[PDB]
């Protein structure tokens, strides 16, 4: 369940209508980690298996804990990897609506990548969900260059990374319920807002 490469494996002749790109947290397995599979299952229920492609950020993104301390909250190599996936999606399936998400270091990675993205592609991301957003305070709860209405941040009371620290406390590991309900609910709503039904 933890590794999904639907975009990379996908047939360009039969593109999905929705493409979800997700970055896992530090030290998590596969390319989806602990929260990604839950979101994926709910998206599949809403759009159907052939209706949505789930793509985790693997490759150069090693999800190394120490990289949380770098300027952008992740490595340059990781940002290049996620940018490349958005670019692959845009090229392979130009008519698909994109959605994105990230947890912890992955949330910083998603924010950094989206900020650097060519605006024509960035504008195709109908909604983005961030859990335990490590740059929440620094970025004032926003993703630079991306609208607030398309952004949903899940930052628990007591999760120190949302408050400008890099300390990992218990609330940082409590996003399970959010990934099973409100997060996919938000993504589905944002996709339907622009695609209709």
UniProtKB/Swiss-Prot annotation:
PROSITE patterns xrefs: CUTINASE_1, CUTINASE_2
Matching Pfam families: Cutinase
Known regulation of activity: Inhibited by n-undecyl phosphonate (C11Y4). Inhibited by paraoxon.
GO molecular function: cutinase activity
Technological use: May have promising applications in chemical and textile industries as it is capable of hydrolyzing a variety of substrates including soluble esters and insoluble triglycerides. Can hydrolyze and thus modulate the surface properties of synthetic fibers such as the plastic poly(ethylene terephthalate) (PET), or the textile fibers polyamide 6,6, polyester and acrylic.
Subcellular location: Secreted
E.C. numbers: 3.1.1.74
GO cellular component, one term: extracellular region
Transmembrane portions of the chain: none
Marked site (Transition state stabilizer) residue numbers: 26, 105
Domain of life: Eukaryota
Function: Catalyzes the hydrolysis of complex carboxylic polyesters found in the cell wall of plants. Degrades cutin, a macromolecule that forms the structure of the plant cuticle. Allows pathogenic fungi to penetrate through the cuticular barrier into the host plant during the initial stage of fungal infection.
Protein's name in the database: Cutinase 1
Organism of this sequence: Fusarium vanettenii
Taxonomic path: Eukaryota, Fungi, Dikarya, Ascomycota, Pezizomycotina
């Amino acid at each position: 369940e933890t590794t999904r490469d639907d975009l990379i494996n996908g047939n360009s002749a039969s593109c999905a209508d929705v493409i979800f790109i997700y970055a896992r947290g530090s030290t998590e397995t596969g390319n989806l980690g602990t929260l990604g599979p839950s979101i994926a299952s709910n998206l599949e229920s809403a759009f159907g298996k052939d209706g949505v492609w789930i793509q985790g950020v693997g490759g150069a993104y090693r999800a190394t804990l120490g990289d949380n301390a770098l300027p952008r909250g992740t490595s340059s190599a990781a940002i290049r990897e996620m940018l490349g996936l958005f670019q692959q999606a845009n090229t392979k399936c130009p008519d698909a609506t994109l959605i994105a998400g990230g947890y912890s270091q992955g949330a910083a990675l998603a924010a950094a990548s989206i900020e650097d993205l060519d605006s024509a592609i960035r504008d195709k991301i109908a909604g983005t969900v961030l859990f335990g957003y490590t740059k929440n305070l620094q970025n004032r709860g926003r993703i630079p260059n991306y609208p607030a209405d398309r952004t949903k941040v899940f930052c628990k009371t007591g999760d120190l990374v949302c408050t400008g620290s890099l300390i990992v406390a218990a609330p940082h590991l409590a996003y399970g319920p959010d990934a099973r309900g409100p997060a996919p609910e938000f993504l589905i709503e944002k996709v339907r807002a622009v695609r209709g039904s």
